[PDB]
Amino acid sequence: PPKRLTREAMRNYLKERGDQTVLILHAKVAQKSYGNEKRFFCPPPCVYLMGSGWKKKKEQMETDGCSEQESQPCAFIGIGNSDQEMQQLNLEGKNYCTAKTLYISDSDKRKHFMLSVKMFYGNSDDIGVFLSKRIKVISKPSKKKQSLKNADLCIASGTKVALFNRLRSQTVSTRYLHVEGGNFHASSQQWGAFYIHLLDDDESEGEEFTVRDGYIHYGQTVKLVCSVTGMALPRLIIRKVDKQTALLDADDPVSQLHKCAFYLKDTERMYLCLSQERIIQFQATPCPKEQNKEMINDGASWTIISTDKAEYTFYEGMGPVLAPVTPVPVVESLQLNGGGDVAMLELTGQNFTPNLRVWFGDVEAETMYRCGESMLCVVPDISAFREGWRWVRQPVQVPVTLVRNDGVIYSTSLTFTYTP
């Protein structure tokens, strides 16, 4: 029998912020299969179960009577939705797992799609169905020049990419750029998401740099920063690859699934190359009859692909619930109205429902639903956080949380700060 969240329960949650997070890490595009072929999604989508809440829930379930088998979360992956072919992910003893065998056939007429993650515990108690960000179906990558008109295939400076290498048309040889143990390596099992930043040509080397806006073009100076570790490679010039060559005179916009070359800016034709698991510096041999072409190593060719991440955070504030936790509301940003009648806060995001309430700390706010991507609420008086405060004395920072009618808490990682 469902229950509303109480200030005591809210207070208790805020004491130990034990949330259960689901991350779906994937590519923004996908190449389609045809004649019974299975052109697997590369890089493989990855489901990570993050947060202190997973252990807290394993503990809760096991004390109630569940075995380790029963308390173990289960995940299944698929596309939205086909004829229900869902692959089991194995997270047994792992905080994450990759979807190594996913593909999309010509039979699917959808121009776009989302991955769906069905989740439940061993005992079959539901968690819910988590959606990836929008994925664009692609016939194959553009062999000739690209236009900014279809920017859905272009690479915007400041967005994230995956970079992989494959030898002799073999799925077995697939190694991905990735940082672990303080180093950049080429993993056959993990993959990194690197921000690709555009720098002006005049820009100097070093730890600090100025990023520029716009679409990435061959010949431009880029900077690749791992979105987890925070490590970068030295300045690189992204270059087109014809076959075993690197074209210098090319200045076309860099597109999805194209083969690239990373010339280490200010070096004697040195490129970012792979040798087994190692990331090295390999020197290109220049073409005898062409000043605009350099022969590069087979491990110096990298397929570039735009990546995205879906993040869902929930907590059983009033204990286990009947209804799934999904669709988990996501808050993109907060804004004041301001600055009109009374202080209003505007929430921009997705998966908002009429049955959600905004909370500032342990204080519930008058909440007004607008649509699934917009919500309005009234900022409570400062006196609701500090007894008898006739005005805001000194700054107070309070968490903004979305709470559901049945007790589920969805934290935002956003706060509201009162100032005089």
């Binding site: 950049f184 930043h197 070093g206 730890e207 600090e208 740099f209 490590m231 490679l233 040195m270």
Partner: peptide, 15 residues
């Protein structure tokens, strides 16, 4: 638009 602070991992040569 914007500044980024990211330590540089130098890829090495061989021999």
């Amino acid at each position: 638009s914007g500044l980024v602070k990211a330590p540089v991992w130098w890829p090495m040569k061989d021999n």
